[PDB]
Nucleic acid binder design. Structure first.
Ligand SMILES: [Zn+2]
Lengths: 96, 115, 112, 100, 69, 55, 68
RNA sequence: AGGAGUGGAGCCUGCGGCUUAAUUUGACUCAACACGGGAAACCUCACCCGGCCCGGACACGGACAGGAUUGACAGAUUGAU
RNA sequence: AGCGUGUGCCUACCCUACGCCGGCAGGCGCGGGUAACCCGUUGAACCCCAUUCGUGAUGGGGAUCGGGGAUUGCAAUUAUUC
């Protein structure tokens, strides 16, 4: 499949900012629900998150519709590696 | 032998009248087929069929064309060509007659066999 | 929704039930669970990330809800956590029968 | 001026206790109050086939719920009404304030 | 005779096209020419009338017991 | 245009426009009072909502 | 695996040998000579040029066909 | 003791049988047969015929920004702009 | 008369009265309702009263069978409904 670059760096810059996110079980949808900025899709976000499932960087939760993902430290080091910023910044889940 | 009339009007007159009095010329069930709004949402196949009818053949029957639409209207401008109805297996190679105006295109299909 | 979500997720540390208290501008909620040390994680990271999950899921004003948890008293007298304990005993390597008599003597001298 | 306090809940005994506590507070804070009305309740009826398969005797579920609504009238400013609705909050009771 | 045009039996016929009330021998000729017209044009309703079953779209598991044996 | 041909039948009516909230089923759904759920899971999780069978 | 009807091939891209080298043709100097005419559309100007067939020209993502 | 009846007349509906590329399928005396809430014009839909795309993540290699790779109007093609 | 039902999550599809147009099915303006408020005192049906019919497959039965006219949707032929 084709993965456009802007949406994927968008989901890094949202996933590093807010660590946990939900996604309703919908492939046939024109617009991703809680990201109302651009015409971002949902199936590409699903495929990226199951890629981090296949590497094991993020855990999985699923109840009826809303796929819940939980990142581990491997996802943290992958995010801070592809972000190319020094690690003096922290994700907001660590912030109290 | 008799010059047939579409309930009073000849076929030369049928090709000499247009839609805006044609929908009073035919019945009410397929008036809404032509008058409820714009015909563009699935009518690209209808437009291509109109191109295939208006393209000019030599002095014989025109070239064969098949369609997968069954709920197609018949018009006086549709008279005198070849269409093929989608029956799943076989396109029925049956001509039309100028006295067929009013019915649908899918009026020529057997079900299975004469058991 | 939230009850079956906690049965899917919080079953690792013995979740029992939920009763959410509706109140405007402060939506408090209590969670009934046994192992309280395993619900907060590492100084309250887990509670805040479940709060962020609820905020991103249900479409609420941010920084409004707060999630509580506590140790259950007379823990043998809640049926969900005892079933989860029997599941945890039967999962690893135990025989079914001796686990049944163990949970039976636990509930009988628990006080029921 | 006129305050039309409408109260919605689910249980009858909790509604009666909350209405009694509101009447007691209105008597304690030295202000007039109108009569406690009891609005009639409607059912919640759903009939379903009890068999997930297509097999069984003709057995069904007859679910019913009585949902409770009630109303009362006040003649006071919003300070005392807000304090009463802010104190003694139980989760089965949803208050509603409307000046009408 | 001040009878409204909707208040007729046959409307827009092939012969005249005017709203006319046509009686027993005339309707016999009308039904004969209509059945021969559908038989000649070989429409779906014409073939259904040619086979001789319920042309109005019904189910024939319990009906038609007295037709053929 | 395959992805342009995903959406050729608009889902605003019929049965494909609607689905359950619990099990992705489209047979035997409850539309009354916005339940939006199949009947068997409604029976399973009725008491968790707060429903009691008084009759 | 192998069905009855012969399957066609998907439109894979071959090795276009030094395409950008054929974008401009330099005779002797440091000047720039444009062989293919640049696209006059609003989306792309002097950065994208039109596709060169033998019958009629075509654009890229603009998708305009200019009649002669 | 009775009453209302059914089975017979016409019609809706389900099953068995025939047939069709396909007529999707389970249940067979109480304890299957207006049953799966199953009143389907398309989705439903699970069946056949017709053509597209992957919804092959990832690991080991080949290949590769000197190209590893995508989206199509002029116009022939089925069924479609 | 009583159980009931009603502006919607993704989700648009609701309940209708008043006032005109045509016999009808329907069309345009027009307000109200999150509901003992608007439909709605649900002027419900069956029954009842004053004519019409008279033992005749008959003023029962409406099966079978053509034409015209309406609303729904992307579209009703294998009759969608009236
Ligand atoms: Zn251009």
């Amino acid at each position: 499949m084709l993965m456009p670059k802007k949406n994927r760096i968008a989901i890094y810059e949202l996933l590093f900012k807010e660590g946990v996110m939900v996604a309703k079980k919908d492939v046939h949808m024109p617009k991703h629900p809680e990201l109302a900025d651009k015409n971002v899709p949902n199936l590409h976000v699903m495929k990226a998150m199951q890629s981090l499932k296949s590497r094991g960087y993020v855990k999985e939760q699923f109840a009826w519709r809303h796929f819940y993902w939980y990142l581990t430290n491997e996802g943290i080091q992958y995010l801070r590696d592809y972000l190319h910023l020094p690690p003096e910044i922290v994700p907001a889940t660590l912030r109290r | 032998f008799r010059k047939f009339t579409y309930r009073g009007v000849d076929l030369d007159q049928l090709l000499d009248m247009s839609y805006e009095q044609l929908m009073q010329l035919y019945s009410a069930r397929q008036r809404r087929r032509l008058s409820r709004g714009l015909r563009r949402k699935q009518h690209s196949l209808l437009k291509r069929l109109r191109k295939a009818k208006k393209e000019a053949p030599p002095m014989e029957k025109p070239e064969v064309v098949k369609t997968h639409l069954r709920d197609m209207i018949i018009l006086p401008e549709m008279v005198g060509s070849m269409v093929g109805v989608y029956n799943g297996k076989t396109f029925n190679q049956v001509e039309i007659k100028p006295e067929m105006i009013g019915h649908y295109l899918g009026e020529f299909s057997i079900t299975y066999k004469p058991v | 929704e939230l009850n079956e979500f906690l049965t899917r997720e919080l079953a690792e540390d013995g979740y029992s039930g939920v009763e959410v208290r509706v109140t405007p501008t402060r939506t408090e909620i209590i969670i009934l669970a046994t192992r309280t040390q395993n619900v907060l994680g590492e100084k309250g990271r887990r509670i805040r990330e479940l709060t962020a999950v609820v905020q991103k899921r249900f479409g609420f004003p941010e920084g409004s809800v707060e999630l509580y948890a506590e140790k259950v008293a007379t823990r043998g007298l809640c049926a969900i956590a005892q079933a989860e304990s029997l599941r945890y005993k039967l999962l690893g390597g135990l025989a079914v029968r001796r686990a049944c008599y163990g949970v039976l003597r636990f509930i009988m001298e628990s006080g029921a | 001026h006129r305050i039309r306090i409408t109260l919605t809940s689910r249980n009858v005994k909790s509604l009666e206790k909350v209405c009694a506590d509101l009447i007691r507070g209105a008597k304690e804070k030295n202000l007039k109050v109108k009569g406690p009305v009891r609005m009639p309740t409607k059912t919640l009826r759903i009939t379903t086939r009890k068999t997930p398969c297509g097999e069984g005797s003709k057995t069904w579920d007859r679910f019913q719920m009585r949902i409770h609504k009630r109303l009362i009238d006040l003649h006071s400013p919003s300070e005392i009404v807000k304090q009463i609705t802010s104190i003694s909050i139980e989760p089965g009771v949803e208050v509603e304030v409307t000046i009408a | 005779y001040k009878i409204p045009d909707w208040f007729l039996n046959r409307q827009k016929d092939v012969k005249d096209g005017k709203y006319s009330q046509v009686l027993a021998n005339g309707l016999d000729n009308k039904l004969r020419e209509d059945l021969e017209r559908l038989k000649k044009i070989r429409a779906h309703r014409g073939l259904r009338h040619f086979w001789g079953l319920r042309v109005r779209g019904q189910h024939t598991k319990t009906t038609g017991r007295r037709g053929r044996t | 245009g395959h992805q342009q041909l995903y959406w050729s039948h608009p889902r605003k009516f019929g049965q494909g426009s609607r689905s359950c909230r619990v099990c992705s089923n489209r047979h035997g759904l409850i539309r009354k009072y916005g339940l939006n759920m199949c009947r068997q899971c409604f029976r399973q999780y009725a008491k968790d909502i707060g429903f009691i069978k008084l009759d | 695996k192998s069905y009855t009807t012969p399957k066609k091939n998907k439109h894979k891209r071959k090795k276009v040998k030094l395409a950008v080298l054929k974008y401009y043709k330099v005779d002797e100097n440091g000047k720039i000579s444009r062989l293919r005419r640049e696209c006059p559309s609003d989306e792309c100007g002097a950065g994208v040029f039109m596709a060169s067939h033998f019958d009629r020209h075509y654009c890229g993502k603009c998708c305009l066909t200019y009649c002669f």
